[PDB]
Amino acid sequence: RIKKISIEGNIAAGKSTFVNILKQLSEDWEVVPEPVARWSNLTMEQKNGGNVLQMMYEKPERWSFTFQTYACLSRIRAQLASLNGKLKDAEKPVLFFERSVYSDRYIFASNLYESESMNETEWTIYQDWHDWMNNQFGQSLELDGIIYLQATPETCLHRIYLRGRNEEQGIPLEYLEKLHYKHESWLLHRTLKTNFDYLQEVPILTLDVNEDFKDKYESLVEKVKEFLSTL
Amino acid sequence: RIKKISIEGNIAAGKSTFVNILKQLSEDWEVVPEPVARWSLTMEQKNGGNVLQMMYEKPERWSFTFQTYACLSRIRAQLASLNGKLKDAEKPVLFFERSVYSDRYIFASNLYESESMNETEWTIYQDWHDWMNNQFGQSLELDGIIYLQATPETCLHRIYLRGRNEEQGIPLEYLEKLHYKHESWLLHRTLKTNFDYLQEVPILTLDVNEDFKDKYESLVEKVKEFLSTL
Numbered sequence: 001r002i003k004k005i006s007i008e009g010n011i012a013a014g015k016s017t018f019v020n021i022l023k024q025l026s027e028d029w030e031v032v033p034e035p036v037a038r039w040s041n042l043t044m045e046q047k048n049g050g051n052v053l054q055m056m057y058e059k060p061e062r063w064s065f066t067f068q069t070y071a072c073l074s075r076i077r078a079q080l081a082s083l084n085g086k087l088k089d090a091e092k093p094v095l096f097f098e099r100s101v102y103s104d105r106y107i108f109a110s111n112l113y114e115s116e117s118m119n120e121t122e123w124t125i126y127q128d129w130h131d132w133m134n135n136q137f138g139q140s141l142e143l144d145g146i147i148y149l150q151a152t153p154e155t156c157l158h159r160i161y162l163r164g165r166n167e168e169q170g171i172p173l174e175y176l177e178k179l180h181y182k183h184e185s186w187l188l189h190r191t192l193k194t195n196f197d198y199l200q201e202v203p204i205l206t207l208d209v210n211e212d213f214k215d216k217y218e219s220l221v222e223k224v225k226e227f228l229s230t231l
Numbered sequence: 232r233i234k235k236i237s238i239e240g241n242i243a244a245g246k247s248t249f250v251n252i253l254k255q256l257s258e259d260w261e262v263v264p265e266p267v268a269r270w271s272l273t274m275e276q277k278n279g280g281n282v283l284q285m286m287y288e289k290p291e292r293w294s295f296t297f298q299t300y301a302c303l304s305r306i307r308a309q310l311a312s313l314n315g316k317l318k319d320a321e322k323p324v325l326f327f328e329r330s331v332y333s334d335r336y337i338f339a340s341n342l343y344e345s346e347s348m349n350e351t352e353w354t355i356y357q358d359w360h361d362w363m364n365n366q367f368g369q370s371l372e373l374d375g376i377i378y379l380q381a382t383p384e385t386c387l388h389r390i391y392l393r394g395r396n397e398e399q400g401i402p403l404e405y406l407e408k409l410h411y412k413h414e415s416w417l418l419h420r421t422l423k424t425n426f427d428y429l430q431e432v433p434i435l436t437l438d439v440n441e442d443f444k445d446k447y448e449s450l451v452e453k454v455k456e457f458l459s460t461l
């Protein structure tokens with residue numbers, strides 16, 4: 001009954017920008033922000049997240065496992081909070097997830113493994129914790145489609161600056177570049193393996209956000225509604 | 232309708248010996264051994280083996296990782312046992328070697344108070360513990376608690392008797408912090424926990440300093456008396 005769609009793409013692709021647009025265009029469309037971003041902006045999770053995000057910045061090799069488990073936990077909790085708690089009588093409800101437990105694992109957590117910020121026991125413990133965390137409480141979270149917002153590392157870095165997050169200025173081009181390749185590989189080229197069978201068959205839509213869209217977004221929105229009707 | 236009874240106590244106090252003894256006595260009696268005991272070649276066992284050793288070498292690096300995985304591996308070992316064992320019993324009893332409350336209020340609380348987890352790691356751990364252990368409604372929730380009470384020197388002896396290489400380092404000192412906390416939780420029933428029904432969980436304390444492998448009958452008579460009131 002509630003169709004669930006994941007918005008995916010690089011740091012500063014413009015995911016929050018696109019969802020802040022989309023949610024206003026129908027009373028039947030709602031959105032779940034990624035908790036990591038709310039942490040980059042105050043309850044105890046707000047409290048915990050600021051600290052662990054600031055720690056993760058300072059010493060990623062120490063804090064990656066802890067940050068990753070806590071970002072995923074927070075995301076799973078919140079996707080439930082919106083999902084059992086919003087869009088109650090809507091006629092054609094769609095909830096749009098700002099990223100997903102799949103980008104937590106097969107993009108960001110995996111990349112932290114590959115750049116040696118987690119060891120094989122951390123990675124493997126995380127993979128077990130993920131599998132299980134999502135199986136136990138995460139089942140109503142199966143994805144109906146994904147929208148990949150594809151954008152260059154260069155735009156992304158430029159967009160980081162336009163946001164002005166002082167904590168974020170030091171994030172370098174080559175980091176944006178490897179995530180770009182983790183995304184291109186999973187959602188465009190489709191090399192990336194996963195332990196979730198249905199991620200093979202789930203519909204993906206790819207959108208170029210290279211050009212600004214803040215005052216020019218109608219074609220983007222048409223590709224969405226069109227895509228939704230295939231589901 | 233399966234009864235859930237946790238067996239609480241200090242390191243090498245006699246939990247695993249006792250639990251094996253109860254399993255032998257009734258066809259309605261089964262055990263859930265504690266995950267970390269078994270780490271002490273499944274995918275859980277490799278990780279478990281590794282993180283335990285990393286904990287023994289540098290606790291203030293690995294305490295958070297350790298506590299998280301220890302509790303997860305427990306929740307899933309317990310969840311599974313409800314889901315196979317004891318379908319065919321009239322008087323079914325599931326004895327757990329330690330509990331989730333054990334994990335958090337004996338061990339995790341101790342590591343943080345002893346500065347091996349910082350504040351963030353401790354509030355993140357507790358957040359997660361609180362969120363998940365409260366998704367399960369009434370499922371792993373205990374019918375009662377059985378506390379095998381020894382002294383630290385008792386526990387030290389038995390650690391030497393038991394003879395695993397890496398425990399041979401455990402200083403009497405640690406066992407002492409681990410004892411005080413079992414008392415505030417179970418005996419004086421001081422501890423304020425986040426789990427309501429647990430304040431209405433009845434407790435059986437057994438004095439277990441006397442070697443009891445040959446003379447457990449008196450202890451087991453009490454367990455029976457307790458299970459019948461329960």
Ligand SMILES: CCCc1sc(-c2ccc(OC)c(OCC(C)(C)O)c2)nc1CSc1nc(N)cc(N)n1
Nearest residue numbers: 011036056057060068071103104108111112115117
């Ligand atoms: C964009 C703010 C979150 C951060 S901070 C960060 C980071 C920060 C500092 C770093 O070194 C100085 C760093 O280096 C990582 C690496 C060099 C690949 O080891 C990554 N990566 C990330 C992305 S990891 C991640 N995982 C999630 N599951 C969700 C999410 N939003 N982000």
Ligand SMILES: CCCc1sc(-c2ccc(OC)c(OCC(C)(C)O)c2)nc1CSc1nc(N)cc(N)n1
Nearest residue numbers: 267286287288289290298301302334338342345347
């Ligand atoms: C018996 C094997 C588990 C270990 S290993 C360990 C440990 C090992 C070496 C240590 O010093 C280098 C150590 O120091 C702790 C301290 C002195 C308070 O920093 C603790 N504590 C423990 C007990 S923590 C724990 N948490 C659980 N959740 C369950 C359980 N059985 N034990």
Ligand SMILES: O=c1ccn([C@@H]2O[C@H](COP(=O)(O)OP(=O)(O)O)[C@@H](O)[C@H]2O)c(=O)[nH]1
Nearest residue numbers: 012013014015016017159162163212213214
């Ligand atoms: O068409 C656009 C798309 C994005 N942005 C800016 O680019 C940055 C990155 O976007 P956002 O924070 O939404 O990115 P996300 O990381 O959420 O994908 C922000 O400063 C946006 O205001 C913009 O000015 N015009």
Ligand SMILES: O=c1ccn([C@@H]2O[C@H](COP(=O)(O)OP(=O)(O)O)[C@@H](O)[C@H]2O)c(=O)[nH]1
Nearest residue numbers: 242243244245246247248389393442443444
């Ligand atoms: O009354 C007892 C109970 C235990 N043991 C021995 O002491 C060690 C520690 O016991 P156990 O493994 O049950 O302790 P736990 O860690 O489970 O509390 C084992 O080698 C037992 O054989 C003993 O000699 N007398």
